[PDB]
Ligand binder design. Sequence first.
Ligand SMILES: [Cl-]
Ligand SMILES: [Cl-]
Ligand SMILES: [Zn+2]
Ligand SMILES: [Zn+2]
Ligand SMILES: [Zn+2]
Ligand SMILES: [Zn+2]
Ligand SMILES: [Zn+2]
Ligand SMILES: [Zn+2]
Ligand SMILES: [Zn+2]
Length: 375
Amino acid sequence: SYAKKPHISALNAPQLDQRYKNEFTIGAAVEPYQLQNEKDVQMLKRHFNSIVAENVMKPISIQPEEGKFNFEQADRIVKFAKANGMDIRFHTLVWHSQVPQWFFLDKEGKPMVNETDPVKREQNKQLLLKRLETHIKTIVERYKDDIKYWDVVDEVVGDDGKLRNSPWYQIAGIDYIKVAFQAARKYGGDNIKLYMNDYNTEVEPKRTALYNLVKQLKEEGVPIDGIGHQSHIQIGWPSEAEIEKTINMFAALGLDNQITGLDVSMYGWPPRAYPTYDAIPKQKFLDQAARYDRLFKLYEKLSDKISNVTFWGIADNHTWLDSRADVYYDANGNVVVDPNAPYAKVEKGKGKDAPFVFGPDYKVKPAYWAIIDHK
Ligand SMILES: [Cl-]
Ligand SMILES: [Cl-]
Ligand SMILES: [Zn+2]
Ligand SMILES: [Zn+2]
Ligand SMILES: [Zn+2]
Ligand SMILES: [Zn+2]
Ligand SMILES: [Zn+2]
Ligand SMILES: [Zn+2]
Ligand SMILES: [Zn+2]
């Protein structure tokens, strides 16, 4: 939406959170160093009223060795949010990636997944669940008064629609999910809100598997308050109709919905990225702006079912999507971005994506104008 609207500094632009303040909070994912950068601080103060840590609250960042808790980085994000009246989301108590390996070693130091004795396997289950409870207990006892929203587990359902067969599941079975939510509620009390977070929540068979899993857990009294939809999406996928169907499906269970990691990639999958920001054609930003226009129109339509929309970053100069921005080169060394076209080599993660409404120079994109207006 719209091109005659100018490329002005985002620090001079109408505030994004204020535009949406009766519909949902507007969040950004951050690293501690961005809180030491004048531009990023001014962006967070101007446009956002919710915050989450990109990385410093993940299990391996918090407890890299058993008994060694590293809260200093997480504390800095909590401090900044309190000083600026921001909601905080905790990402994340449990995840199969970025996972300290000590969790899954038995008393003899051997991988628990390798045990064959059923009596010893049950001992490893109880030991892993005890470690899980202590991890969650320590974090929630520190932050329960400060952090309202918790990703209790991330990505526990596989893309094949079965439970993800991570070491958590191999060793402890489904109970690791139940234990995590129960521990968060026990040590955090009734006022913190507990979420199951995942990507491709719109895609079958994952969508209905997520639905059935959460429905069953709530029937058994496991405290789950909502679903986090990571929403790592593309310009043309998934459809707005399928997003709407997903959000309604989970709201029908009585669950809150949060959009927890929104980015709108310029590319498909696997991505064939441009090598630099400057090489991305202007038309891509117009296509992106129209996608954002439709997306936030839908979020507003469903505002009674969505409490928060968080972007997985601040401005286009920093996005984890760049780690996926593979650049394909033909035999003559020219960039290939056509997903079917011939090519000779790929430089993995060397390109540039552009997923936000704010450009890498902190000036507003067409996508910003598309979601700040009321059309
Ligand atoms: Cl990143
Ligand atoms: Cl620019
Ligand atoms: Zn308004
Ligand atoms: Zn504000
Ligand atoms: Zn450049
Ligand atoms: Zn709402
Ligand atoms: Zn980052
Ligand atoms: Zn610019
Ligand atoms: Zn609009």
